[PDB]
Amino acid sequence: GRVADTVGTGPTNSEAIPALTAAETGHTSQVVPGDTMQTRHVKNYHSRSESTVENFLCRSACVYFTEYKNSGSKRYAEWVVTTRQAAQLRRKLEFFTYIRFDLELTFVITSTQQPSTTQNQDAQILTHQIMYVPPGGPVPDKVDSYVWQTSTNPSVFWTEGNAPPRMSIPFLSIGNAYSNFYDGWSDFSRDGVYGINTLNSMGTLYARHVNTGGTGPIKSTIRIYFKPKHVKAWIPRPPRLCQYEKAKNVNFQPSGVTTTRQSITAMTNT
């Protein structure tokens, strides 16, 4: 894991020309300082461990959050699982064309009492259900549906005040890797929406209150955190320059290649 040492070199007068090459060939020069100047010998101990692909990707990030109430219209939350709605993790993943990983999911669930006129509020403690529906499974259309029975769908039940709930998911693709980019169509006539496949289909998450607590209104928020683990990745790419616009495509607004300075010899930015 260590970085390379510096070989000490003395003066030189010869036909060897390490510093002259031809960039046309597609080759990157392997020159070191000793090729073009006198250097001392250095015993370098610095390490490259913090820039492995795993260490670069393996931190928790919030990919999405939403809300649901204990009364009224929106009694449960519903989210198609994806990495493309939050900028910071999407950008890190799109350094690579193809990638395999497992996931650690952590949920941060919090609640807030809402303004009301109801007197004598003595709410009991709230439990929450989170259900994961794989693609193709039937989905709940109301907070009191037989679907929440979860005979075969994994569900986590969690009571407020305890540690946040967490579970692992294996690499889940029908392909040999997830594809971050797809230059093509799903329909053989190419008259459809471009860039859409189902190699990244992961399913849907539903969240509800199991009990209502008390007589007052209460709104909860669920934040979903993805941490990739056991990562393998292929075919590095230029990082995303333009700001993201849509979750389902790469559409952008054009922008300059960097920011400006005053003149070609100016030593500061503008």
Partner: protein, 124 residues
């Protein structure tokens, strides 16, 4: 989602506009199918008014007195991925923005069509 969600269509008075709304389902989308078409007219300040609905295996017309009998679905089989509609005997008072809303939980998609109707039949 719907194939081309933003577009604009130009036709002449007396002709009959085709408003395409073609959609594709994801494997996650397993709820029941709902299809709504609503309208925001250019001349008028009324906004977001249903003109034709499809739900629970059947169609519902008779929502916009103005388009009475002149708004229909074009497919013999709507739930295969076709929610396009025909408007007929076009006149200036319907120039506006039509909206196609397709629902099948978890999935939801919409499409905006800006219909311009011109006096003379000519794309210039």
């Amino acid at each position: 989602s719907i194939t081309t969600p933003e577009e604009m269509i130009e036709k002449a008075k007396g002709e009959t506009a085709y408003l395409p709304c073609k959609f594709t389902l994801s494997p996650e989308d397993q709820g029941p199918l709902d299809i709504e078409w609503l309208i925001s007219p250019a001349d008028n300040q009324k906004v977001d008014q249903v003109i034709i609905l499809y739900s629970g295996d059947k169609i519902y017309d008779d929502y916009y007195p103005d388009l009475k009998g002149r708004v229909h679905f074009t497919s013999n089989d709507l739930k295969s991925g076709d929610a396009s509609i025909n408007v007929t005997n076009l006149q200036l008072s319907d120039i506006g923005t039509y909206q196609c809303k397709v629902k099948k939980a978890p999935g939801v998609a919409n499409k905006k069509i800006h219909l311009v109707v011109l006096v003379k039949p000519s794309g210039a």
